[PDB]
């Protein structure tokens, strides 16, 4: 001024001394407003590199400490620090921006103020720390649904794909994390596929890093949701199935689970329904449905439910010993989904071929089904109903089913208000009465239990469902053409014949 001179302007000395005053009483004072904010702003605008650095470190430590929603004016200076050429300023400023980007509103506010291009150009510089931090920012910003569209259509997927291959593990973690967060919507997945990041992920399923391989597994699992993606992946990278199968035995459990789910998503299509079995995933799954951890059980039984759709797999599936663990899973009462998956699996297995039927029966499947045929959710009831409908079409199995007192389960199910349950149960009952050598159990179940077959016929004759009236009539004719006197005079009751209208 007049007595002395310094290299630093007086407003900035003001700022620095005030800042010193604040940094040792963080408790008491809010930093995203007022005094602290004007200090930091002044220090951002300054000529002096050291003061800028000081501001950046300040911002970084503050944002590290606590995260709240902040105004325009908290963000502008950090965005200006981002424009700096000083490496450590870049580091601190990015870290601060990400710590702020933890909070949801701040994500939208940051992206809307145009932070994307700074972050992107930071990522294309070859200082590793700023790569890690800037990519990290993109990662945290890509967790808001509003943003990921705008992030995708900005060209960030290209440096993300690039940096996902980094020899530095921190960078790779943040990068693959971002790529993962870009797989929550269909169009983001489309954009992600276009950038050619799929071969990178597929390759990085072999990463020894837990975080990286988990992120890539989850990302691929999320991509497999779309059918076009599934086809294109079946064409492009054939090795995927194998790698996922091997990942079903990973050190980390979340990886086993997510990989199993990815295999389910893939198993939605038939080519994969076969190729998973070729890759020898049946052992891992057998081990997994018998496991303790119920998410693994859920994933594995959903997966096997999808795989069992293809008939050609059937034998393999039975020869791998799946039946009794599945029947065991039927006892699980607390998870409706596991029940549904297991019973649906059984339905698939039975519906496919009539060859390993013997093994199916020997598994104790039918008795468990009979046991749950009334005490179970309508879902399970429905699948059990379909299953019975399937089994009652094997002429050689008819008398055995009848002998196992299957009518005691079928007859009440025909009261169910669910079209599938009642319908298929009635069809099964009808086909059990058709052309059997012995009508004993049919006779014994004429009135008992639950009003018996007589009650059944009487009711379904008066249904409006044309098909039901017809299965009633057809049942009657199948009983008349039974060449068994007793039953033919059981039809002498003409409740049936004046209602046979």
């Amino acid at each position: 001024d007049e007595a002395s001179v310094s290299p630093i302007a007086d407003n900035e000395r003001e700022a620095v001394t005030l800042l010193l005053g604040y940094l040792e009483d963080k408790d008491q004072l809010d930093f995203y407003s007022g005094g602290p904010l004007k200090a930091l702003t002044t220090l951002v605008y300054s000529d002096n590199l050291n003061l800028q650095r000081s501001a950046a470190l300040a911002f970084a430590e503050i944002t590290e400490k606590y995260v709240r929603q902040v105004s325009r004016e908290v963000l502008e200076p950090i965005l200006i620090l981002l424009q700096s050429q000083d490496p450590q300023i870049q580091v601190a400023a990015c870290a601060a921006l990400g710590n702020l980007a933890v909070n949801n509103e701040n994500k939208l506010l940051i992206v809307e103020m145009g932070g994307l291009e700074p972050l992107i150009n930071q990522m294309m510089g070859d200082n590793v720390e700023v790569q890690c931090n800037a990519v990290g920012c993109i990662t945290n910003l890509a967790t808001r649904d509003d943003n990921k569209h705008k992030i995708a259509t900005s060209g960030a997927l290209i440096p993300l794909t690039k940096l996902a291959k980094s020899k530095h593990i921190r960078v790779q973690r943040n990068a693959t994390g971002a790529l993962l967060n870009m797989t929550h919507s269909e169009e983001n997945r489309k954009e992600l596929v276009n950038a050619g990041a799929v071969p990178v992920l597929v390759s990085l399923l072999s990463s020894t890093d837990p975080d990286v391989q988990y992120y890539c597994t989850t990302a691929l699992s999320n991509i497999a949701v779309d059918e076009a993606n599934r086809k294109k992946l079946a064409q492009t990278e054939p090795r995927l199935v194998s790698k996922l199968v091997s990942l079903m035995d990973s050190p980390s459990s979340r990886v086993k689970c997510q990989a199993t789910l990815a295999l389910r998503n893939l198993a939605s299509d038939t080519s994969y329904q076969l190729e998973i079995v070729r890759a020898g995933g049946l052992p891992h799954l057998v081990k997994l449905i018998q496991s303790d951890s119920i998410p693994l059980v859920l994933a594995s039984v959903a997966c096997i439910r999808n795989i069992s759709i293809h008939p050609l797999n059937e034998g393999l599936i039975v020869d791998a010993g799946f039946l009794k663990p599945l029947v065991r899973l039927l006892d699980y009462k607390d998870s409706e989904e596991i029940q549904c998956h297991a019973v649906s699996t059984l339905r698939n297995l039975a519906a496919s071929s009539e060859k390993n039927r013997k093994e199916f029966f020997e598994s104790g499947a039918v008795e468990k089904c009979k046991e749950l045929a009334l005490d179970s959710p309508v879902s399970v009831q429905s699948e059990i109903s379909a299953c019975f409908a399937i089994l009652a079409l094997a002429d050689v199995s008819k008398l055995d089913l009848l002998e196992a007192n299957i009518l005691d389960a079928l007859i009440p199910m025909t009261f169910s208000q669910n079209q599938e349950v009642s319908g298929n149960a009635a069809a099964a009952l009808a086909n059990l009465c058709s052309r059997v050598n012995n009508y004993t159990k049919i006779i014994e179940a004429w009135d008992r239990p639950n009003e018996g077959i007589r009650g059944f016929l009487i009711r379904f004759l008066k249904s409006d469902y044309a098909t039901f009236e017809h299965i009633a009539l057809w049942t009657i004719l199948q009983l008349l053409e039974s060449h068994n006197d007793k039953v033919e005079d059981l039809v002498k009751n003409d409740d049936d014949i004046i209602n046979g209208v």
Binding site: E64, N174, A224, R264, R305, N306, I309, R347, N348
Partner: peptide, 26 residues
């Protein structure tokens, strides 16, 4: 031959995993 037919969408339909990645900094 008159088996009950499985609905085209009667399978375990694919889902998007709910996991969201968190960034780690300096």
């Amino acid at each position: 031959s008159r088996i009950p037919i499985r609905q085209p969408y009667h399978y375990s339909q694919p889902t998007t995993a709910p996991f969201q990645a968190q960034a780690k900094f300096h």
